[PDB]
Amino acid sequence: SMSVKKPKRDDSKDLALCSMILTEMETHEDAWPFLLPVNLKLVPGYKKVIKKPMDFSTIREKLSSGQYPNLETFALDVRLVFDNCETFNEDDSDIGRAGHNMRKYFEKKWTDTFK
């Protein structure tokens, strides 16, 4: 509350460390469904159904331009990528499996770096 604060967690390396995680996600072999924004002209249904599209290139540009206020808003966009993927893709498809794999990969790096 006013003039009553928990001890200050060092957040000075968060930007660098989110960039490193994002590099590791970009270079994973199963990243290919997620590297670029889904082409809303060429994929029927995507625009109407997926209210907030998100992809790794868009996270990279937001990260680089100071549009994440803190590491939690960064994790929300990463998770959005996978939640969108599960909304639109069967679990038993190459893309559906890619999304589960990447989400697992992310959540481990997240826990190991920050928790």
Shortest CA distance to 75 belongs to which of 32, 113, 33, 47? 113
Q: Are 22 and 56 in contact (CB under 8 A)?
A: yes
- Chain centroid, CA 29 distance in Å: 16
Shortest CA distance to 36 belongs to which of 88, 81, 96, 94? 81
The technique is X-ray
Element (H, E) at 114: helix 94-114
Q: Are 55 and 32 in contact (CB under 8 A)?
A: no
Cα gap 59→22, rounded to integer Å: 8
Cα gap 101→78, rounded to integer Å: 13
Cα gap 57→88, rounded to integer Å: 19
* Cβ-based burial of 52 (10 A; exposed 0-12, middle 13-18, buried ≥19): exposed
Cα gap 44→2, rounded to integer Å: 52
DSSP E strands, the chain: none
Domains assigned to the chain: 1-115 (1.20.920.10)
Element (H, E) at 63: helix 56-64
